[PDB]
Amino acid sequence: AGANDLCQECEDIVHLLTKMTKEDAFQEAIRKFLEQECDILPLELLVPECRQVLDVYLPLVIDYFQSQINPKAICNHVGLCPRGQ
Amino acid sequence: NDLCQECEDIVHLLTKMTKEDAFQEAIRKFLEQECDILPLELLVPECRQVLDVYLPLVIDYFQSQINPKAICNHVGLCP
Ligand SMILES: CCCCCC/C=C/CCCCCCCC(=O)OC[C@H](COP(=O)(O)OCCN)OC(=O)CCCCCCC/C=C/CCCCCCCC
Ligand SMILES: CCCCCC/C=C\CCCCCCCC(=O)OC[C@H](COP(=O)(O)OCCN)OC(=O)CCCCCCC/C=C\CCCCCCCC
Ligand SMILES: CCCCCC/C=C\CCCCCCCC(=O)OC[C@H](COP(=O)(O)OCCN)OC(=O)CCCCCCC/C=C\CCCCCCCC
Numbered sequence: 001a002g003a004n005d006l007c008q009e010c011e012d013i014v015h016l017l018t019k020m021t022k023e024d025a026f027q028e029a030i031r032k033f034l035e036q037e038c039d040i041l042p043l044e045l046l047v048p049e050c051r052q053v054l055d056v057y058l059p060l061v062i063d064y065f066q067s068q069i070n071p072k073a074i075c076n077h078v079g080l081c082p083r084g085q
Numbered sequence: 086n087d088l089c090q091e092c093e094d095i096v097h098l099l100t101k102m103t104k105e106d107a108f109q110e111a112i113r114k115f116l117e118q119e120c121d122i123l124p125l126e127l128l129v130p131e132c133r134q135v136l137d138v139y140l141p142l143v144i145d146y147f148q149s150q151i152n153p154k155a156i157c158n159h160v161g162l163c164p
Contacts, residue, residue, distance in 0.1 A: 002101075002104060003105045003106075003107040006108055006111075012098055013095050013099070016098075017095075019086055020086070020088055020091050020092070022086070023086050023088055026088055028161075029088075030160065033160045047128060047129060077115075079110075079115055080107075
């Protein structure tokens with residue numbers, strides 16, 4: 001019962017992300033937070049060039065949830081939807 | 086758009102999902118595969134070791150006594 005709800009729960013998270021990423025206040029908040037985390041342990045060592053990785057990939061992740069037609073497919077891709085999205 | 090409530094709802098859903106063994110299995114299998122290929126294999130050195138350390142810790146965290154508004158305030162999405 002719990003495990004069969006994982007697909008819908010994942011899709012609900014994706015739906016929330018698609019709404020939030022339409023707010024530039026969301027991008028700014030997450031950028032600023034991750035910029036601070038890149039500068040401190042453990043992330044500064046787990047991800048070399050953390051700030052450069054962030055500068056490149058955060059716009060791409062944001063754009064994915066903003067512009068993809070079917071971002072909920074992520075939930076099938078990560079294995080949480082054994083019967084399809 | 087209420088970014089604060091949207092963030093709190095994501096946290097609530099994560100706490101439900103992380104209770105399930107099948108969630109841990111699926112995410113681990115997916116990330117083990119990504120650690121072996123680009124881009125993650127280069128972005129995160131010793132990727133599989135980082136996965137083994139932190140996936141349990143993150144799963145346990147969302148199962149513990151957490152404060153969702155404080156978390157969302159920490160990431161800048163709640164006042
Ligand atoms: C103390 C805890 C620390 C744990 C963190 C340790 C490890 C961190 C690793 C993070 C860095 C890896 C970032 C990789 C992102 C990425 O590759 O996205 C690219 C891809 C592909 O983009 P393309 O346009 O096709 O082209 C790209 C190249 N051709 O972008 C996407 O498709 C978007 C999907 C990516 C989703 C990213 C996940 C973000 C969602 C998070 C949900 C919430 C998780 C909870 C976090 C709790 C943390 C305590
Ligand atoms: C943080 C990832 C952002 C994804 C999008 C966020 C969307 C919605 C918000 C969902 C909330 C889940 C994440 C909040 C968890 C969090 O980090 O806050 C708590 C914790 C503190 O907990 P503790 O002080 O130890 O325990 C007592 C207090 N709890 O905050 C932290 O400091 C942990 C920071 C870990 C950093 C994780 C790295 C981000 C991973 C993926 C981001 C992918 C984006 C692509 C860019 C790549 C950047 C390298
Ligand atoms: C985006 C999150 C929505 C689902 C929420 C479920 C809760 C947690 C999920 C955590 C795992 C992140 C989900 C992976 C996102 C994903 O599938 O993108 C795959 C992308 C390509 O995007 P696609 O659209 O599928 O194809 C491109 C063609 N357009 O490929 C990737 O590079 C994925 C890299 C994933 C890196 C994210 C790291 C997650 C951070 C912390 C996880 C917890 C600690 C463990 C860290 C170990 C990291 C080595």
